[PDB]
UniProtKB/Swiss-Prot annotation, chain A:
Site description Reversibly protonated during proton transport, residues in chain: D60
Function text: F(1)F(0) ATP synthase produces ATP from ADP in the presence of a proton or sodium gradient. F-type ATPases consist of two structural domains, F(1) containing the extramembraneous catalytic core and F(0) containing the membrane proton channel, linked together by a central stalk and a peripheral stalk. During catalysis, ATP synthesis in the catalytic domain of F(1) is coupled via a rotary mechanism of the central stalk subunits to proton translocation. Key component of the F(0) channel; it plays a direct role in translocation across the membrane. A homomeric c-ring of between 10-14 subunits forms the central stalk rotor element with the F(1) delta and epsilon subunits.
Organism: Acinetobacter baumannii (strain ATCC 17978 / DSM 105126 / CIP 53.77 / LMG 1025 / NCDC KC755 / 5377)
Record membrane topology: Multi-pass membrane protein
Top-level lineage group: Bacteria
Pfam families attached to this UniProt entry: ATP-synt_C
Main subcellular location of this protein, as a coarse class: membrane
Location within or outside the cell: Cell inner membrane
Family per similarity comment: Belongs to the ATPase C chain family.
Protein's recorded name: ATP synthase subunit c
Family matches, as CDD domains: ATP-synt_Fo_c_ATPE (cd18185)
Transmembrane region(s): 7-27, 55-75
Swiss-Prot record, chain B:
Subcellular location, record wording: Cell inner membrane
Subunit composition and interactions: F-type ATPases have 2 components, CF(1) - the catalytic core - and CF(0) - the membrane proton channel. CF(1) has five subunits: alpha(3), beta(3), gamma(1), delta(1), epsilon(1). CF(0) has three main subunits: a, b and c.
Upper lineage: Bacteria, Pseudomonadati, Pseudomonadota, Gammaproteobacteria, Moraxellales
Biological role stated in the UniProt entry: Produces ATP from ADP in the presence of a proton gradient across the membrane. The gamma chain is believed to be important in regulating ATPase activity and the flow of protons through the CF(0) complex.
Residue range from the parent sequence: 50 to 97 of 289
Name of the protein described by the UniProt record: ATP synthase gamma chain
Top-level lineage group: Bacteria
Amino acid sequence: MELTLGLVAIASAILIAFGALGTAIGFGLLGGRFLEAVARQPELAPQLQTRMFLIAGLLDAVPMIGVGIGLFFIFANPFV
Amino acid sequence: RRVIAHLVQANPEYKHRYMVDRPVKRVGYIIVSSDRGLAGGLNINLFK
């Protein structure tokens, strides 16, 4: 039961860190390639950044979801 | 020249010394002429 609580803590840690890794990879790839691309075409930077933030938003939804639900269980644990 | 222009509009990232003039200190001249005269002053007009 308290060890069940430890289970919950572990699960939340899993989600938060492991989705954080999801973000850490996606955003990094996007940054590297985006810098390279804008270097190739240094003129239309506005739309470039526009679609860049587009993709960034499309990216990190579900990892942040896991983070949020993990913290929720950390504090508003169902069946404490 | 067509594909050259396509390149440069595609890649305006630079202009080489072969497309844009740097300040000149010596200027080169490619001078064509003949080995047989008897052609008026055509060559002579060019020389002038």
